[PDB]
Nucleic acid binder design. Structure first.
Lengths: 29, 95, 101, 225
RNA sequence: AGGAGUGGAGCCUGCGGCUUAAUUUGACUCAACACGGGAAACCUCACCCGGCCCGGACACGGACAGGAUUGACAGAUUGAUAGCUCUUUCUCGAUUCCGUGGGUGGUGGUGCAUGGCCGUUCUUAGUUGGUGGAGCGAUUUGUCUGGUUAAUUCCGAUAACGAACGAGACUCUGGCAUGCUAACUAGUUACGCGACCGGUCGGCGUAACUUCUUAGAGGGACAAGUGGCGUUCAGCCACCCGAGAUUGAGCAAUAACAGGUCUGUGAUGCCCUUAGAUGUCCGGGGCUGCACGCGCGCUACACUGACUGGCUCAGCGUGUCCUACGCCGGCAGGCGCGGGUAACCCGUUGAACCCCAUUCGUGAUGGGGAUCGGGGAUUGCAAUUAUUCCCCAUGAACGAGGAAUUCCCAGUAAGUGCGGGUCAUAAGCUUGCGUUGAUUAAGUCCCUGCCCUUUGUACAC
């Protein structure tokens, strides 16, 4: 789940990856 | 174990199909199979051997074991008791 | 015929008093001489358990209770009609016991 | 002679506790909700509440037939004195047992904790409750334990209205790497009995009727009838 | 301000520490230390010394009906009549064994891998969206200068309005009802009867009825009335009438502890162990050992007392093991008889301080009973490492306790017994109950600690 991944990992090392996956989930594609 | 203790265990697994216990190892008499002098250990370990075959369903509670029939347990019993399929157990008595 | 007594015991009070009122109204319907519902001293079972499972904290205790209200209505009527009235108002949570002669 | 009323009334309790424990352990898949033991010296019937009651029976009344003989040969009382009755629940959304096993289905069905808890939350709040809370605790992500509350609506925590306006359920789910435990509470609504919620209102909820406009007088009317 | 103390003595219990074959282990400021319902003779039971059993399901291959397994008397060894092993060499018809796989059961390890429960911050009064304002925004207002309250309890101002959780309300309990409902398992009053001097009867049976006794429904109290003090507002104080103008508890938010608990769980992950078994039964020790420290307590140190007679009163509870009655005994106890699954029997629960008399009179006393020798009697398979209980002896410290420190504001401290849990035998523990029943305070932030507002930061673990 990209929402839960983003809210858990936004501070960690994997913050940019979960941000990109959240934006992929949000803005179509 | 002796063989005559095991043969009276399958008979009440056909008409009804269920068999309970106590998980008491040193209990000298299983009270449901009275007048046969079978211990609780020799029905409990026998059903433990039957659960690895896959012929009884395991469900435990506070103290008592519980064992149901399997749908493949009817055919395994009807030949072991040498019964015909013309007689009907308590499955199809009401309605 | 003497000493026809009905024992009504329950765990709650509301359903027990409703069953008592229905039995007294039904005995009024049968026009019998009826000793009403007497009220026995209610029993309360006390169990006082330590609240913790291990034994670490500040020694707090629990205090459980079961209040068993017990009533008795009494009749002076022959034995054939006392079985008719007790069989109508079947109701959960209560327990009925009758004694005769 | 029989047993004393003190020891009788407690022994009616340990019967319904072991029965409910064994019923949860067996019927934790077909949505078991609760028993109702109507005692009678003729037949002590046991009414099973369930979500999908037709699937409890088996093939034309086959699966519960096993449970009849189980409870017959277990508790010592003879046959012909017990009648099982698999009854459909009133609302599954207003039963804490029925929701806290549905969340086990979704968590063990491999779904995100957010969507599962919010879907059960949506279903409870659309089912008519005044509010509910779902707490999932354990090793949710990693190996340091978290908790996750999902509050929605109203909830009571204090005083005697917590005894009949909420219903709690604690279920342990078994995952690969440990145990999660979920806790679900539902604050039940009103409706003086429609068989849902308490009849009693909340003890600080004052409700004041609206006054009706009486026709104001101008002249002293002495109207005979 | 005081009261009772504790810390001082003996003893009892729990921790360290010394030993030990083993003295199983958790828990160490509040938030460990009479806590683990933890008062363990065996079991419990983890620990130590030995000794049996498989309770190794299931699958594979071998042995395989020239047998794998089992009981084995007697002798030997043992602690055993444990066949556990050698001889004695027989049953036992594959119920098995050997290996390979892999399960199992573990009060074994991690509680810093977890669940659940509990404890603590904190029972302090805190907490938070929605929509609206203000800001580019982080954010802020609401959630406040103030008065008031036990309380973010309210008034009042007021860019906020309404709400919600917690508080309160609620639930249980205590106090009032000669109003109601009733009552042969509770009674009152009356009438006869019976007994002894119109009197005493817990003595007998009818009769009015509920005051007493039970338990339901409902009232009742709301700062309501009056007088002060109040932005005369929220409210505070005093009094009247009243049973009562604070009854005591239960429940208890958000967010948190690397709080405790795998030893309560067939809640549980991994790890260890699995047939000289960390599984389990059997038997015996140990858990209690004792130069010394530390905590809960009990008995006390006397005359406001002790010893002995007499008299007189409870409540909450338990009971298939509780006990009524007659006999034998100094007594603990023996015998038989009954009742009670219980407002019916114990039971009128004939409790102890307290009271009324006798003796002892300020001393290491007869206070105080520890420590010890003998018997006697119960519960148990078993009492020596006294299990308890009774009777004779012996008589210790102890002369009101430093530094320090705990709890408490009304049927409350404190004194005093009774009951429940544990319980075969068992309370100095704890949890409840009644009886007797006060001193002082009705205030503050000085100490202990918590919170809020104005400082400022080199702070943002």
């Amino acid at each position: 789940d990209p929402y839960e991944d983003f809210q858990e990992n936004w501070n960690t090392k994997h913050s940019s990856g979960v941000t990109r996956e959240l934006m992929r989930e949000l803005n179509g594609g | 174990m002796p063989k005559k203790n095991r043969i009276a265990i399958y008979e009440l697994l056909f008409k009804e199909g269920v068999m309970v216990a106590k998980k008491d190892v040193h209990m000298p008499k299983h009270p449901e199979l009275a007048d046969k002098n079978v211990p609780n250990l020799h029905v409990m370990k026998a059903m433990q051997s039957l659960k690895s075959r896959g012929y009884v369903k395991e469900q435990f509670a506070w103290r008592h074991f519980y064992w149901y029939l399997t749908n493949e347990g009817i055919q395994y019993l009807r030949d072991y008791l040498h019964l015909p399929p013309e007689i009907v157990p308590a499955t199809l008595r009401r309605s | 015929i003497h000493r026809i007594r009905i024992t009504l015991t329950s765990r709650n009070v509301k359903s027990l008093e409703k069953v008592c009122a229905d039995l007294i109204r039904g005995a009024k319907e049968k026009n019998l001489k009826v000793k009403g519902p007497v009220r026995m001293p209610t029993k309360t079972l006390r169990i006082t358990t330590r609240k913790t499972p291990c034994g670490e904290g500040s020694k707090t205790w629990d205090r459980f209770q079961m209040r068993i209200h017990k009533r008795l209505i009494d009749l002076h009527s022959p034995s054939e009609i006392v079985k008719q009235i007790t069989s109508i108002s079947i109701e959960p949570g209560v327990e009925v016991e009758v004694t005769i002669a | 002679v029989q047993i004393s009323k003190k020891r009788k009334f407690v022994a009616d309790g340990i019967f319904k506790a072991e029965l409910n424990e064994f019923l949860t352990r067996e019927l934790a898949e077909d949505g078991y909700s609760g028993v109702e033991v109507r005692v009678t010296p003729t037949r002590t019937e046991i009414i099973i509440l369930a979500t999908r009651t037709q699937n409890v029976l088996g093939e034309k009344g086959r699966r519960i037939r096993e449970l009849t003989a189980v409870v017959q040969k277990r508790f010592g009382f003879p046959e012909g004195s017990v009648e099982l009755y698999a009854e459909k629940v009133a609302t599954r959304g207003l039963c804490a047992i029925a929701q806290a096993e549905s969340l086990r289905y979704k968590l063990l069905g491999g779904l995100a904790v957010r969507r599962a808890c919010y879907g059960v939350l949506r279903f409870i709040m659309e089912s008519g409750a005044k509010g509910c809370e779902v707490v999932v605790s354990g090793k949710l992500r990693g190996q340091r334990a978290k908790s996750m509350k999902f509050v929605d609506g109203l909830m009571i925590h204090s005083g005697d209205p917590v005894n009949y306006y909420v219903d709690t359920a604690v279920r342990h789910v078994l995952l690969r790497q440990g145990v999660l435990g979920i806790k679900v509470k539902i604050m039940l609504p009103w409706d003086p009995t429609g068989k849902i919620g308490p009849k009693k209102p909340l003890p600080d909820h004052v409700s004041i009727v609206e006054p009706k406009d009486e026709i104001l007088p101008t002249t002293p009317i002495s109207e005979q009838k």
